[PDB]
Paper text:
The therapeutic hormone insulin is a small protein used daily in the medical treatment of diabetes by millions of people. In the presence of divalent ions like zinc, the monomers assemble into hexamers, where each of the two central zinc ions is coordinated by three histidine residues. In the hexameric form, chain B has been shown to exist in two allosteric states denoted T and R. The R state has two allosteric binding sites usually referred to as the phenolic binding site and HisB10 anion site.
The crystals grown at pH 6.5, from both the urea- and thiocyanate (NaSCN) screen, were found to belong to space group C2221 with unit cell parameters a = 59 Å, b = 220 Å, c = 223 Å. The asymmetric unit contains three insulin hexamers with a crystal solvent content of 64%. The hexamers have R6 conformation and contain two zinc atoms/hexamer coordinated to three histidine residues (HisB10). In both the C2221urea and C2221scn structures, one co-crystallized resorcinol molecule is bound to each insulin monomer in the phenolic binding pocket. In the C2221 structures, the majority of the B-chains (11/18 and 14/18 in the C2221urea and C2221scn structures respectively) have this conformation (conformation I) where the phi/psi values of ValB2 are -80/+45. The C2221urea and C2urea crystals were grown in presence of 3 M and 4 M urea, respectively. Each of the two hexamer-hexamer interfaces in the asymmetric unit of the C2221 crystals involves tyrosine-tyrosine interactions between different Tyr A14 groups.
Residue numbers in the entry:
A (entry chain A), D (entry chain C), E (entry chain G), I (entry chain K), K (entry chain I), L (entry chain E): 1 to 21
B (entry chain B), C (entry chain D), F (entry chain H), G (entry chain F), H (entry chain L), J (entry chain J): 1 to 29
The structure:
């Protein structure tokens, strides 16, 4: 999930956007 | 040391700013 | 509204802490 | 929703839990 | 300045990016 | 109320996230 | 990396508060 | 409104920063 | 106390330092 | 060092939330 | 203390409330 | 720079002030 994707390497704001409603 | 917990706190802050009025689901699973 | 914007930023942090493993759904609209 | 409820007066931790999954 | 511009109506990511180096 | 002060605090956090490696000047008027 | 990213986040807040009306320059490289 | 609540959240931050190893007491009232 | 002193107008870090242990 | 310093920043945030009107004493020791 | 108890392993809000006034 | 100085060891308030305008 997000924690796996984004807590070992930095997620871009676009990558973050994946989790918006 | 507690670093997923701390990372998750920054993650929600960053999601908040990216998502805006759309909002977001945060599911740590 | 910026007042809402700033309030929401604190709301999601509070939800992050209180919800724990459940996560949360932030939907301002 | 959460803004109308919790930005107009302070929500308790139990009130905020309404918004947990 | 940025405070005047962004502290009443929300500046988007896009708008904020104008302040980057 | 210290609204400009609190707003500026969230602004620099937003700038931090948006500007990434480019960094940014914060120069309050 | 993530760690540096989380650290930079607190750094800009500390700069905000310590620098006051002077403002600051955040240049991470 | 929740203005005092948001303000206190920033105050404990700023206290954390300035007080260093001393820590601090936070008592609204 | 701290809320009355510092939430209506800005306290400097030096003023806040009064509340340190 | 820095990771305890960052962690303490979040700890005081969580105490602010959970302690409410009671407030809290933060003392690294 | 708190750093020792809570920076190595996650403390719940319930555990953290032990440090309230 | 600041990341190298202040993310490996805790910077004092005065060290941080080097980065003020
Ligand atoms: O990958 C991440 C983790 C935390 C915050 C962020 O903006 C990005
Ligand atoms: O009503 C609120 C608003 C923001 C944060 C919080 O913990 C409660
Ligand atoms: O207009 C604003 C004010 C503060 C934070 C932000 O992301 C936007
Ligand atoms: O007067 C204040 C209020 C909140 C944060 C701060 O640094 C100062
Ligand atoms: O164990 C911890 C450490 C930091 C914040 C928190 O909510 C819990
Ligand atoms: O060395 C540091 C790193 C982050 C915040 C701070 O005040 C000091
Ligand atoms: Cl705020
Ligand atoms: Cl952190
Ligand atoms: Zn705020
Ligand atoms: Zn952090």
């Amino acid at each position: 999930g997000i924690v796996e994707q984004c807590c070992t390497s930095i997620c871009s704001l676009y990558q973050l956007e994946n989790y918006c409603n | 040391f507690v670093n997923q917990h701390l990372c998750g706190s920054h993650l929600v802050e960053a999601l908040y700013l990216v998502c805006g009025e759309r909002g977001f689901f945060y599911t740590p699973k």
